[PDB]
Design an enzyme around this catalytic site. Structure first.
Site, mmCIF file in Angstrom:
data_model
loop_
_atom_site.group_PDB
_atom_site.id
_atom_site.type_symbol
_atom_site.label_atom_id
_atom_site.label_comp_id
_atom_site.label_asym_id
_atom_site.label_seq_id
_atom_site.Cartn_x
_atom_site.Cartn_y
_atom_site.Cartn_z
ATOM 1 N N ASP B 49 0.901 -1.177 0.000
ATOM 2 C CA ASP B 49 0.000 0.000 0.000
ATOM 3 C C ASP B 49 0.951 1.243 0.000
ATOM 4 O O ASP B 49 1.955 1.151 0.698
ATOM 5 C CB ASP B 49 -0.838 0.010 1.308
ATOM 6 N N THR B 82 -3.325 6.287 -2.992
ATOM 7 C CA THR B 82 -2.001 6.476 -2.351
ATOM 8 C C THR B 82 -0.855 6.132 -3.281
ATOM 9 O O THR B 82 0.097 6.941 -3.394
ATOM 10 C CB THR B 82 -1.861 5.686 -0.991
ATOM 11 N N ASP B 380 -9.166 1.223 3.838
ATOM 12 C CA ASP B 380 -9.172 1.966 2.628
ATOM 13 C C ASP B 380 -10.388 1.749 1.777
ATOM 14 O O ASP B 380 -10.973 2.613 1.149
ATOM 15 C CB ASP B 380 -7.885 1.514 1.783
#
Lengths: 509, 517, 514, 58
Positions: B49, B82, B380
């Site tokens: 991530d 991200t 998320d």
């Protein structure tokens, strides 16, 4: 030192110093002063326009220069414009004296010729007594005389500074026959303009004033660096603040302790406590109620100024003053000084010897430049007090000595014949210093002064009339010198010059 | 120190920016690849991530850190995006350099980049504009969830995680509140579970259990005595301590603390409770009195943790034992210890069939890495779904949307008279960076993949056809159900330009070197 | 050990030093201008667009570089705008002097040539100054509104600005009594609205700590009593020194319950002096927050020191280092407390404030990075409009005036000189760099914009300047680009004193040698 | 110069060009600057062929 060989110190070391000296008085001397930047060990910007100050601050590494340093310092005490002279006359004479050596002239044969010339120079100086004025009851006469001194030491407001220095120095003693060196003391307080500086008389404490008034005529003082945190030597000097339980009884207890202290001074005689020590939160409260003045937070400088005038003596102990620790001032009162609240005492009939000019400037940078003008101007007043002989403006003095010294080469001969001539050129170094400031040919400056043939009038000052050439009367302009100024300078200058010129190699392993 | 200006300033900025951008692009999308990184602690951290990667690395130069901050705000607002925001940012700086050596000043680049991104937000607004009620949302929401969960790697039997999330955004949130609810959301992970079991906890879980098994495993609705009282040593901030000596003071102390603990149990039970939650828990000694006056209790609750349990349940506070009343007691439906699917996961639930003002999303996994990965997928995922509950405007990711936008930007770029025109077209190639970088992940050559997608956007002018993003040998984004929030992509595009615009603007740099952290 | 260097090598050291420091603040100020990022060791990074800030943090070793601190600071304190310009100008005079001094042609009549220019230069600005309070309006808030619009468009926005500009007008009148650079502060949020702003007439506090209640804890008062504390609350409260032990017999549970009573006392002293609403600089404890919710009172920890200082001026009150209040100039009161969420972040609003000489703008930009410059726009707006009230004489902005002074000094350069031509012309050239640079870093033709304006001045006019919104020619008095006349005048005198000083110096003595 | 002529070509088409008087942006419709069609066809087709050989060259 380190070892030397081949008589290096005479050829080599003498010319290194000459240069080191040069251009820190070859442009900050005469009718416009010029700033030089000096950074001190506690680094800050410091502007100098004065010969004596810049040398105190420098560390002289040359042993050749160090003699010359001492003679400038005598001249700082004595004139404050003969101090600028020591350097320029002296450096120039060695440069020229080096030329003579090569030809084969012996070091001492030339030293003979410089000495008969100096005695001779002194004989010409009563021909350079042009007019005599001296009123020490008049601010008006005094300001014009100081005017060329302060000019050299400032680039700022020449006219306005001249009135403040004149106002202090006349007003303190208008019937004295001799004056003092520390007759005026500076007080350097932050804020405002340069032309917002003013004149007070007596001691000013530039550090914080508290308590509360209680008198304006009884100005008895007792001087201590001893704190009032809990330091008293009549009893125990120990505090109790390391324990929470005790510390509380102690805070409450500090009130009563402080009343014992304040009375202890006062009863034997005080109204204003001079305190270089520190005044606590609770301490500050008891003096406000009780109504005795505090002048808190005084550094060593502040306390010493005070001690020297009144004869009050400080200790790091607190006990009631004896008489030797008690001083008195004619008055005290609380009024703003430059528009900042401080304590002002009066002295002008107690013993005098302390007047105060408040030097203002919103930064400390603007103040130093005017510190030089006043401090040098103290000692210039001390010449005008002693004598009335009035010597024309800068650089107009210098020509005539040179013309009559050239005559002195022709009438005397010998092997001194050469030395006398370079003695002549060496007085011309001073207006060549003004030609070097003006950035025009040296030669042309010198040409005008000989052509008009006026001796005691004409010189090239620093103007915009010095850029496209002109000559002007420095006899009549508010630019005047004094006799003794030049008489001292030359004497000590020739003292310094000759004696560095004697030096020979340092003998060590 | 040195003064870096101009070219010196911008050279440094590409060098720093790129290093971050390269890891992100090779971990982009659901075809994305795991990155196994070691610390200098001898440990190993397996990441994918974009945010954890920014936390991990402390590479030189300020520019690295400015991307780090940017990503953090966006994890709360959008969630995912991200990886996407940072790779797009480095593309701008590569293009700016190409135009900078041609002789283009960075202020020209700056205004034209800001102007191009406004062309792109307008293009992305076209695709949907629907806002629909909460029930209708639930099928589109679950399809979006697959994708997001997929971009933290694996999504097979992760359909529980998606279906619990729709419940989770509904409870905490309103439909047109327009505020955040992820400080109301507690993420919980415990090792020994499965990724095939995901549970929705309509209360709160404390990791503690009953003091005895002999005490009852059920507690009534409500009547929770919230307490700060010791039944074990409370570790006092008082000072000098003294110990018992010999048989007699030992005995005296023991009988004293036993006597006081029984009196305390009785006053709690009298004002009405059947659950004691005590800050300072229960000792072996204390167990004896508590069974004897029969009252289930939890041993130990953290200092701040006791506040978190109160707000969540909506229960009414009782600070301490000195503050006991029957008019203020906390809320419950039941208090029971729960075994989720294994006896390796033991959490004790104070669950609500009353008012719930927080939701605990309890996800499990059998090992430390597995819970890490699962918590980050799910948070998320939850966040992107909160943007969509409010307004169910959806666009199909995988870079399809970006290609369409690249066509729209490239045309609009040149129809302005100002010197920005060159920037604006570079902006159009810079949007293309994201299906290009996806391709690297897929196993496909970067270049031909983008231009296949592009022909299909010449036809429709809408993303819903494209290339592979799951890998299954389809050329669809609507038979793959690759879906991201509309606000979310719009957010990666606007934030990245806003950030890089500060970086082009600043060319005034005081460093000794070229980079300092 | 002492380092002393003289003559020309020292003269060229001094000048050169000055130029390096200027590069920083040269290209800056604008939306088409630059910002400055200085790292002077790790975690000592700031973003700024004020000249003064960077230069203090920057190291200096030259006296020419040290000179510039005193110049930037006095500008910044008063206006808060045009700080970069003075330091640019201070350095610029020296640049054009540099071939003469190398040559060794250096009168000290050269510095005196500058002092003469400064005089002619300043007379012009006042002369062309048109007092705007007389000239226009009678209500004069709409006058102030126009300055606001252009000022918002000299740091960033050129379209959101029209909405943002009326808020500034109101704030500016509350605030005007002396410029505050810390009661005009702006709070940040995003994610519940984007690109909208609200004026709040009181204060706000970003930081509050409470998790034991929120819906169950009251947060609306119509007559708050504000405790402006700096003390800490603890779990249990420490007792005073000497005695008290844990266990021997009796002390085991005894001591524990006492600690609870002291903690309770510190709380009860707060309450009974005057508390419904608590702000405290240092953390509110765990059992403390629970206590406050129990009694039905609001509490807030993690307050910064700065925020508390804003609130007191609004209240008429003060900060308390004590846990009680015996005066109403030490306790704070307002007539509204409310707590409302904007963007989903808690803001403690106090409004209806007795004095209300403080303002808070709650600003939503589009990004966190975006907000930083949008805050700077509003801030530039408040300073400059205020400085317009104070010095009602106002001239054209845009660096419009400077091109006319370059030309004015060029005309006198022709008339005056016996050598002065090089130096008065140096002064004139120096002025033009300041708008020319903003064209140049922007990437438009500086020759094409300035020289065209000088030309129009010649037919008649003086206010034709550079609009930096797009960096092209514009009327910047009909476009209402305005900055006071005094700003420029202060700039000229201070700048010319810095330059003069350096050229005077041909010796720098470093007495520590370090 | 070349950013601005692009925008003139985009809207109008047959507009501005590099003019020898101005040094810059003014119409070439007001001052005829003509080249034969083969002279421009030649520049392009020959150029491409040369670039073709080099790319093909090992």
């Amino acid at each position: 030192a380190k070892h030397f060989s081949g008589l290096e110190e005479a050829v080599y070391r003498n010319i290194q110093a000459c240069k080191e000296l040069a251009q820190t008085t070859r442009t900050a001397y005469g009718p416009n002063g010029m700033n030089k930047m000096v950074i001190n060990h506690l680094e800050k910007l410091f502007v100098t326009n004065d010969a004596a100050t810049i040398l105190r601050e420098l560390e002289v590494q040359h042993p050749a220069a160090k003699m010359i340093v001492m003679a400038s310092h005598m001249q700082e005490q004595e004139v404050g414009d003969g101090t600028n002279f020591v350097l320029v006359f002296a450096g120039a004479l060695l440069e020229l004296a080096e030329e003579l050596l090569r030809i084969g002239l012996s070091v001492s044969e030339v030293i003979e010729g410089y000495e008969i010339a100096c005695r001779k120079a002194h004989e010409i100086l009563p021909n350079l007594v042009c007019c005599s004025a001296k009123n020490l009851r008049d601010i008006d006469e005094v300001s014009s005389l100081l005017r060329t001194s302060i000019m050299s030491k400032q680039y700022g407001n020449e006219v306005f500074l001249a009135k403040l220095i004149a106002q202090a120095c006349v007003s303190i003693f208008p019937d004295s026959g001799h004056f003092n060196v520390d007759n005026i003391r500076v007080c350097k307080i932050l804020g405002s303009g340069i032309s917002s500086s003013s004149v007070l008389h007596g001691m000013v404490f530039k550090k914080e004033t508290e308590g509360d008034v209680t008198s304006v005529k009884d100005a008895k003082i007792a001087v201590y660096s001893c704190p009032f945190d809990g330091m008293i030597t009549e009893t125990k000097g120990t505090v109790l603040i390391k324990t929470a339980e005790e510390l509380m009884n102690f805070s409450k207890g500090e009130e009563n302790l402080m009343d014992a202290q304040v009375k202890a001074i006062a009863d034997t005689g005080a109204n204003v406590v001079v305190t270089g020590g520190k005044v606590a939160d609770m301490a500050l409260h008891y003096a406000n109620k009780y109504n005795i003045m505090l002048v808190r937070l005084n550094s060593k400088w502040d306390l010493r100024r005070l001690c020297k005038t009144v004869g009050a003596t400080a200790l790091p102990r607190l006990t009631p003053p004896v008489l030797e620790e008690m001083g008195h001032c004619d008055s005290v009162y609380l009024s703003e000084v430059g528009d900042t609240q401080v304590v002002v005492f009066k002295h002008e009939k107690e013993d005098g010897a302390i007047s105060t000019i408040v030097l203002r400037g919103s930064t400390d940078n603007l103040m130093d430049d005017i510190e030089r003008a006043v401090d040098d101007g103290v000692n210039t007043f001390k010449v005008l007090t002693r004598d009335k002989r009035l010597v024309p403006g800068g650089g107009a003095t210098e020509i005539e000595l040179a013309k009559q010294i050239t005559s002195y080469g022709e009438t005397c001969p010998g092997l001194e014949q050469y030395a006398i001539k370079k003695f002549a050129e060496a007085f011309e170094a001073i207006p060549r210093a003004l030609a070097e400031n003006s950035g025009v040919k040296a030669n042309e400056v010198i040409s005008k002064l000989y052509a008009v043939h006026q001796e005691g009038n004409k010189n090239v000052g620093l103007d915009i009339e010095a850029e496209v050439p002109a000559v002007k009367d420095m006899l009549e302009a508010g630019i005047l010198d004094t006799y003794l100024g030049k008489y001292w300078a030359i004497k000590l200058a020739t003292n310094a010059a000759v004696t560095v010129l004697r030096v020979d190699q340092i003998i060590m392993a | 120190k040195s003064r870096l200006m101009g070219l010196e300033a911008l050279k440094s900025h590409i060098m720093a920016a790129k290093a971050v951008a390269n890891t992100m692009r090779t971990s982009l999308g659901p075809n994305g690849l795991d990155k196994m990184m070691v610390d200098k602690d001898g440990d190993v951290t397996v990441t994918n991530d974009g945010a954890t990667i920014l936390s991990m690395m402390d590479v030189d130069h300020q520019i690295a850190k400015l991307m780090v901050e940017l990503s953090k705000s966006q994890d709360d607002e959008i969630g995912d995006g991200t990886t996407g925001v940072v790779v797009l940012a480095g593309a701008l700086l590569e293009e700016a350099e190409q135009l900078l050596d041609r002789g283009i000043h960075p202020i020209r680049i700056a205004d034209g980049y800001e102007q191009a991104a406004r062309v792109a937000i307008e293009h992305l607004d076209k695709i949907s504009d629907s806002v629909l009620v909460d029930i209708k949302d639930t099928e589109p929401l679950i399809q979006t969830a697959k994708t997001t969960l997929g971009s933290k790697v694996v999504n097979s039997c992760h359909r529980q995680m998606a279906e619990i999330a729709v419940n989770a955004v509904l409870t905490v949130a309103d439909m047109e509140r327009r505020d955040v609810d992820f400080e109301l959301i507690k993420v919980e992970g415990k090792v020994g579970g499965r990724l095939e079991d995901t549970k929705l906890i309509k209360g709160v879980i404390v990791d503690k259990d009953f003091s005895h098994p002999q005490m009852p495993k059920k507690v009534e609705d409500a009547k929770i005595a919230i307490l700060t009282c010791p039944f074990e040593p409370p570790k006092p901030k008082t000072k000098h301590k003294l110990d018992v000596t010999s048989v007699e003071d030992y005995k005296a102390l023991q009988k004293y603390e036993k006597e006081k603990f029984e009196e305390m149990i009785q006053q709690i039970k009298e004002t009405g409770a059947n659950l004691a939650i005590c800050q300072w828990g229960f000792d072996d000694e204390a167990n004896h009195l508590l069974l004897q006056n029969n009252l289930p209790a939890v041993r130990w609750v953290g200092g701040p943790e006791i506040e978190l349990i109160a707000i969540a349940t909506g229960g009414r506070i009782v600070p301490r034992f000195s503050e006991l009343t029957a008019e203020k007691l906390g809320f419950a439906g039941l208090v029971q210890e729960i075994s989720f699917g294994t006896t390796k996961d033991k959490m004790l639930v104070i669950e609500q069939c009353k008012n719930s003002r927080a939701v605990t999303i309890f996800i499990r996994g059998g090992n430390k890495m597995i819970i890490e990965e699962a918590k980050r997928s799910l948070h998320d995922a939850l966040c992107v779904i909160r943007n969509l509950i409010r307004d169910n405007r959806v666009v199909y990711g995988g870079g399809a949307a970006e290609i369409s936008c690249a066509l729209a930007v490239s045309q609009e770029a040149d129809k302005c008279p100002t010197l920005e025109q060159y920037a604006m077209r570079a902006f159009a190639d810079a949007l293309e960076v994201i299906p290009m970088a996806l391709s690297e992940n897929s196993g496909m050559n970067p270049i031909q993949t983008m231009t296949e997608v592009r022909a299909r956007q010449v036809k429709e002018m809408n993303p819903a056809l494209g290339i592979d993003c799951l890998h299954k040998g389809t050329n669809d984004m609507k038979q793959q159900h690759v879906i991201e929030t509309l606000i979310g992509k719009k957010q990666q595009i606007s934030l990245a330009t806003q950030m890089v615009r500060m970086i082009l603007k600043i060319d005034d740099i005081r460093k000794p070197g070229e980079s300092e952290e | 050990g002492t380092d002393s260097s003289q003559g020309i090598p020292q003269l060229v050291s001094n000048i050169s030093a000055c130029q390096v420091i200027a590069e920083a603040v040269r290209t800056t100020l604008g939306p088409r201008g630059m910002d400055k990022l200085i790292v002077d060791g790790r975690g000592k990074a700031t973003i700024s667009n004020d000249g003064a800030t960077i230069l203090k943090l920057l190291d200096v070793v030259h006296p020419a570089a040290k000179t510039l601190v005193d110049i930037a600071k006095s500008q910044d304190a008063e206006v808060g705008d045009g700080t970069t310009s003075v330091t640019l100008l201070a350095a610029e005079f020296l640049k054009q002097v540099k071939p003469y001094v190398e040559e060794g042609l250096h009168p000290q009549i050269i510095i005196r040539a500058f002092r003469t220019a400064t005089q002619l230069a300043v007379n012009k600005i006042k002369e062309i100054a048109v007092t705007v309070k007389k000239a226009d309006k009678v209500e004069q808030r709409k006058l102030l509104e126009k300055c606001a619009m252009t000022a918002l468009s000299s740091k960033l926005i050129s379209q959101q600005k029209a909405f943002f500009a009326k808020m500034v007008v109101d704030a500016v009148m509350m605030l005007d009594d002396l410029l505050q650079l810390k009661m005009i502060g702006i709070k940040k949020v995003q994610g519940g609205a984007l690109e909208d702003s609200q004026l709040v007439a009181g204060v706000a506090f970003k930081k509050t700590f409470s998790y034991a209640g929120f819906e169950m804890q009251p947060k609306k008062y119509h007559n708050p009593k504000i405790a402006l504390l700096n003390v800490e609350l603890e779990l249990k409260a420490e007792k005073d020194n000497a005695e008290i032990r844990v266990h021997t017999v009796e002390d085991y549970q005894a001591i524990v319950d006492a600690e609870w009573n002291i903690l309770y006392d510190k709380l009860e002293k707060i309450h009974h002096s005057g508390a419904k609403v608590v702000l405290s600089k240092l953390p509110i404890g765990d059992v403390a927050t629970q206590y406050f919710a129990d009694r039905d009172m609001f509490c807030a920890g993690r307050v910064p020191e700065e925020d508390l200082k804003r609130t007191m001026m609004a209240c008429g009150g003060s900060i308390q280092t004590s846990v009680n209040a015996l005066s109403a100039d030490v306790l704070g009161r307002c007539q509204v407390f409310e707590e409302t969420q904007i963007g989903g972040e808690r803001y403690n609003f106090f409004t209806g404030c007795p004095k209300a000489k403080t303002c808070t703008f709650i600003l939503r930009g589009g990004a966190e990075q975006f907000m930083e410059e949008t805050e700077r726009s509003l801030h530039d707006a408040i300073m400059i409009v205020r400085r317009a009230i104070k010095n009602d004489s106002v001239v054209a902005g845009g660096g419009a005036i400077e091109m006319e002074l370059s030309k004015y000094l060029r005309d006198y350069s022709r008339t005056i000189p016996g050598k002065q031509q090089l130096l008065i012309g140096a002064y004139a050239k120096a002025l033009e760099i300041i708008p020319r640079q903003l064209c140049d870093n922007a990437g438009f033709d500086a020759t094409n914009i300035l020289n065209k304006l000088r030309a129009r001045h010649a037919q008649g006019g003086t206010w034709y300047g550079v609009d930096i919104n797009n960096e092209d020619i514009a009327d910047n008095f009909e476009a209402f680009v305005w900055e006071p006349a005094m700003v420029r005048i202060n700039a000229l005198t201070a700048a010319s004193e810095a330059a003069c000083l350096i050229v005077s110096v041909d010796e720098t003595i470093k007495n520590p040698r370090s | 110069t070349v950013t601005e002529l692009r925008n003139r070509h985009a809207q109008g088409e047959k507009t501005a060009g590099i003019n020898v008087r101005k040094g810059g942006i003014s119409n070439i419709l007001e001052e005829l600057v003509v080249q034969p069609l083969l002279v421009s066809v030649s520049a392009l087709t020959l150029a491409t062929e040369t670039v073709r050989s080099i790319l093909k060259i090992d």
